[PDB]
Every structure is written in structure tokens, then in C-alpha cells.
């Protein structure tokens, strides 16, 4: 265990930030790690949603919740497309309670849009919740739009730190050997390329930029009563320590693990497209088994949870794979 | 006295039933008549059976089932009352069930009209209202009497 | 040409349709719903809301 | 009769409901595409494989 560490937790300014990270920890269960890597490529039939958390963003130490949804969005760009709406519902509290002014002009526009009109966007001027039930329809969560905003550039900024990484490839080693694909065209995400230079590693530098701009949001939140001023300073000893730990993983993360997905994209059985390189516009395009003589059976449906671990995706499986995990470090 | 329309030896009676029952006015039936399907789950729920009771008893049984099914309130509107009994800033994540768990609504009037009638008859009634209240504040650890 | 309600006539009828209930519809049970405490009591707002 | 096992063919099992069963009597089940509404579209010539 080494993600609340570095020594210097024997400082009575950390005590609050101490338990916040500790009560957000998971254990390195061998099977739980494998299930996260496998869910990234495997097709689904039940519309799974995240294990929801109730947390009113009170103090500067509550940034440890929004940062979790950042790291979950990178290592898994697909798998993030399905839950982009339910993760949005608990993200709006960070844009309302944390800083109140910018949300007032954003919700004035609306919380949901339709992608139709053969192009363009149709934002509905009303505030509504997500729920995850209306996932498979004509409703995209409007907080992930990208549309250049009128009077809250301040929010439309950090609302870009969820951007997809790597490239999308047309898998050929499956279509050349005639494996059955349920999509007309075989496609996938990668999802983060590999090393190109000698000692650069752009994936590690991209995260460094996130840490840089995400630090200013914490180093600006004007608080009062002093106890948050105590944790407002002792949070950078976690905000900067974590970014150094990251540059010690990225090499063995975007090389040995990158070639893993590259091959696994084109297996015998995998057939559907779970691509998510554009969170602004993407839908499942499901099929149905119907007879003209009164029969109806869909392929993907809302029912959940089933008596299997293939519903409710745990988002806490991020901290064990940054600390309590030795890679082959590249026999 | 219609299901025996072709099983009795008594000759005169047989021709008479197979005449007024065969009539273009009335008709006899037995068993499953129709089915009401589910919206989201897609399973059979409320089935109609052409049963063999009498009209006086069958009328009463239908008032109960209709009031149970037309309540429109799922067993999930139960956690909204279960939450009014804890710290103001707490919440729940409901195990969604929907139409598969219909629950009759909580009566607004019959209770307040009765808890008023009982209040006058038994004036000691407040005894177990100030008592249930005092058992709550004691269970929340607000005051502990140390010695000074 | 409609059906005359039989709940108001004299002569007693036998064998009417009764709205039953299949095994699916379960009533009066339990939900394993969980709680999440307000974590801190100091920053709770009853004042307005 | 032919060794082919059927652990749970034709029914869905939710953990907070139990075991609900569907019917298995389709006919000319032509797998076609659903529109966002739910209403059946058409063949989808030029797409769908």
C-alpha cells in the first residue's frame, strides 16, 4: 500500500484528507483486475451502470471524487461511453455547490439534447435528471457535447479533460479470416497507442497537463473557517505525488498492455462495435428478433441486476492498479 | 346445472338445457378467458378465469384486486417514508422492482380520523407518544451526564 | 346492444369471470436497500432547502 | 434426449425478483432493426450486412 504515502502523514493538516482517500480504497483481488481488462472489449446485453455514490462536494478534499472519474475515463475510453450519463448526474454537484455562478447559465440552456436534424444539435431548454433507463433512445447527455459555450468557458474547459485517447483502427485480422461480425464494418478503439520517441512518452505528458490545470481549480476555491485551508495546502502533497507515480507506470502500460488490446480486438467470437472515440455522438444501433405473427425479443434490454457480476460496474477499481500492482515493468 | 348438458339419463331435462343454453341469447364458458401482459418485463401478470363461484362472492373479490392493482404505487415509494425517520441529509439506493411489487397506498384520512377519536377516549394516549420520542433522542448520544 | 350489469338484478347467477393473480406478483416483503450516512453532521443544512 | 444441456433456456433471472419465465413460441422471426421509438423499421437496404 502506497498512495496516501510519501511519509509526512504525521501532519495534523492531512488528517481530513487522510480518511477521504482511505475510505475510497480497494484491494488487489486478482480476479477483480482481470474483469476490468476483459469488460473493455467484450460485448454486452444488459445496460450496466455504476455503483452510485452520495457525496455533497463540501470541502477542497472532495476533489478526490471527480479525479476518480477522470482516471476511469482514460484507461477505459470505451466502457465510459455507456455510463457517461450516470457519471454526469453526480458531476453536476461539483459545478453547482463547488462554484455556483457557472451552473446557473449552463442549466439555463438545458441538460439534454438530440443529435438529429440530419446534423446539428437540438438542446431542450429544461433541467432533467438522467436515470440510465433512457440510455437506448434519442437522448445524449448535454454535458459531454463539446459545443463552444456562451458564458461559461470556465466550465467548457475542464469539460474536455475526458477526451478519448489513442486511435480507432479497422481490425483486418478478423475480416480477412471471415469471422462473423454483427456490425457491417469491424471497428474498435486501442485505446492509447505506444512509445514513438526515445524518452518522451506523450501519454504520461498528457496526464501531466491534466494535473496542471486541475490544480488551479483546487488552488482557487475561496473557502472560509480555516479547516479547509489546512486541507487546501496538504492536498498538493497528494496531487503531485500521484503524478510522479504515474510516470513510473506509463511505459509498462502503453507497450506491454497496449499490444494486448491490439490483438484481442479481433478474436473469433467478438462481433459488435463498442467504439467510443467521440462521446458527442455514438449509439448502440441494436437489432431485434420480430415475427409478423406477434413476437418480440430484443438483443439489448434494461433489466438489471442479473444474478451475474455483469451489471453495476465498480469505479473504485482504479487505485489498486496504480499502486498495489507490479507489472513485468516493460521473461 | 349446465355442465351436464350431455351426461344425464333423464331425457326430458336434457333437451331443455340444450335449448336455452344453445339459445342466441346466453352462452356458457369455463377456464382461462384472457391475459394481461407486462410493459417492461414482458410476462403474464393478471389473468382472468371464468370461475365457478356465484356473482355475490365474485363481486367482492374483484374490489380487492382492483384496489391493489390501481394503487399505481410500487414498493419503492416505501423508502421515501423510511427516510423521514433519520438524519436530514441521508439517502438510499432503491433495488428497483416496479410493477412486479404493487403496494396499496397509505391511507391519509382513516388514520388521522381514528388517532383523533382514540385521543379523546383514552387521555393517557400521549404517554406512548412522549415516550417513543424520548427513546429516540436518548439513542442519538447528545447529552451524557458527567460529574463536576 | 350492451351487457346489463348482473349486480342489480334478482335471480342469482353462477360461474362469472374472476380477476385472479399469477405467482409473479409478490406482496408484502423486504428490500435490501442500503444507507449512506451524511458523513459529517456539522455541514448539514435544515435552515432553508 | 440428445445430451444437449439446458441450464436456463428461455427465462431471465434477476437477483431481486427471482426467476421469471418467457414464452418460446416465435414464428417467422426475421431479425430486423429497431428504431429509437421501438417500432420495427424496414429491411435497411444498403446497410445491416
Amino acid at each position: 500500500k502506497r498512495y496516501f504515502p510519501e511519509n509526512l502523514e504525521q501532519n495534523q493538516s492531512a488528517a481530513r484528507l487522510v480518511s477521504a482517500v482511505k475510505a475510497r480504497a480497494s484491494e488487489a483481488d486478482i480476479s477483480s483486475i482481470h474483469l476490468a481488462i476483459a469488460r473493455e472489449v467484450s460485448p454486452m446485453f444488459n445496460v450496466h451502470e455504476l455503483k452510485k455514490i452520495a457525496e455533497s462536494f463540501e470541502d477542497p478534499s472532495s476533489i478526490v471524487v471527480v479525479l476518480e472519474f477522470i482516471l476511469f475515463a482514460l484507461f477505459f475510453p470505451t466502457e465510459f461511453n455507456r455510463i457517461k450519463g450516470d457519471i454526469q448526474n453526480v458531476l453536476l454537484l461539483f459545478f453547482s455547490r463547488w462554484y455556483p455562478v457557472e451552473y446557473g447559465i449552463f442549466i439555463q440552456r438545458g441538460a439534454t439534447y438530440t443529435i438529429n436534424a440530419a446534423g446539428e444539435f437540438e438542446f431542450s431548454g429544461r433541467n432533467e435528471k438522467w436515470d440510465q433507463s433512457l440510455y437506448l433512445s434519442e437522448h445524449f447527455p448535454a454535458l459531454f457535447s463539446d459545443v463552444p459555450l456562451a458564458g461559461a468557458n470556465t466550465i467548457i474547459a475542464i469539460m474536455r479533460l475526458f477526451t478519448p485517447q489513442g486511435f480507432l483502427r479497422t481490425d483486418d485480422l478478423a475480416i480477412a479470416a471471415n469471422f462473423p461480425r454483427a456490425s457491417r464494418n469491424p471497428q474498435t478503439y486501442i485505446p492509447y497507442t505506444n512509445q514513438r520517441g526515445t524518452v518522451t512518452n506523450e501519454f504520461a505528458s498528457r496526464f501531466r497537463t491534466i494535473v496542471a490545470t486541475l490544480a488551479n481549480v483546487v488552488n482557487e476555491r475561496a473557502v472560509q473557517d480555516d479547516m479547509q485551508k489546512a486541507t487546501r495546502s496538504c492536498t498538493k502533497q497528494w496531487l503531485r505525488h500521484l503524478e510522479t507515480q504515474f510516470d513510473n507506470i506509463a511505459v509498462a502500460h502503453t507497450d506491454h498492455l497496449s499490444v494486448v488490446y491490439a490483438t484481442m480486438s479481433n478474436f473469433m467470437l467478438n462481433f459488435t462495435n463498442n467504439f467510443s472515440g467521440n462521446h458527442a455522438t455514438f449509439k448502440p444501433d441494436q437489432y431485434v428478433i420480430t415475427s409478423p405473427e406477434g413476437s418480440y425479443k430484443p438483443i439489448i434490454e434494461r433489466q438489471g441486476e442479473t444474478v451475474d457480476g455483469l451489471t453495476i460496474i465498480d469505479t473504485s477499481i482504479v487505485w489498486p492498479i496504480l499502486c498495489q500492482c507490479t507489472y513485468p515493468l516493460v521473461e | 346445472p349446465a355442465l351436464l348438458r350431455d351426461f344425464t339419463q333423464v331425457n326430458w331435462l336434457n333437451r331443455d338445457i340444450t335449448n336455452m343454453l344453445q339459445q342466441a341469447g346466453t352462452k356458457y364458458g369455463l377456464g382461462l378467458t384472457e391475459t394481461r401482459l407486462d410493459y417492461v418485463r414482458l410476462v403474464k401478470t393478471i389473468v382472468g378465469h371464468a370461475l365457478n363461484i356465484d356473482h355475490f362472492a365474485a363481486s367482492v373479490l374483484n374490489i380487492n384486486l382492483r384496489a391493489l392493482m390501481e394503487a399505481n404505487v410500487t414498493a419503492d415509494d416505501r423508502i421515501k417514508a423510511l427516510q423521514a425517520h433519520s438524519m436530514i441529509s441521508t439517502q438510499f439506493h432503491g433495488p428497483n422492482q416496479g410493477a412486479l411489487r404493487p403496494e396499496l397506498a397509505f391511507d391519509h384520512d382513516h388514520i388521522i380520523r381514528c388517532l383523533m377519536l382514540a385521543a379523546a377516549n383514552y387521555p393517557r394516549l400521549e404517554g406512548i407518544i412522549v415516550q417513543i420520542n424520548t427513546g429516540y433522542v436518548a439513542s442519538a448520544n447528545v447529552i451524557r451526564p458527567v460529574s463536576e | 346492444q350492451v351487457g346489463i350489469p348482473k349486480l342489480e338484478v334478482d335471480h342469482i347467477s353462477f360461474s362469472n369471470v374472476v380477476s385472479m393473480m399469477t405467482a409473479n406478483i409478490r406482496t408484502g416483503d423486504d428490500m435490501a436497500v442500503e444507507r449512506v450516512n451524511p458523513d459529517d453532521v456539522r455541514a448539514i443544512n435544515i435552515r432553508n432547502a | 434426449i440428445t445430451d444437449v444441456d439446458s441450464t436456463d433456456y428461455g427465462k431471465l433471472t434477476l437477483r431481486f425478483l427471482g426467476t421469471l419465465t418467457r414464452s418460446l413460441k416465435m414464428q417467422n422471426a426475421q431479425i430486423r432493426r429497431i428504431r429509437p421509438d421501438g417500432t420495427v423499421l424496414r429491411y435497411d437496404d444498403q446497410i445491416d450486412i
Binding site: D29, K51 | - | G28, A32 | -
Partner: peptide, 16 residues
């Protein structure tokens, strides 16, 4: 220790 679990959680019991 905070162990990673997937599905919904079980605690108090509601009632008819």
C-alpha cells in the same frame, strides 16, 4: 479493509 464489490448493497429492511 475496503474491498471491491460489484452489485448493489444489502443493509436495512423495508417493510409492507
Amino acid at each position: 479493509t475496503k474491498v471491491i464489490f460489484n452489485g448493489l448493497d444489502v443493509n436495512t429492511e423495508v417493510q409492507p
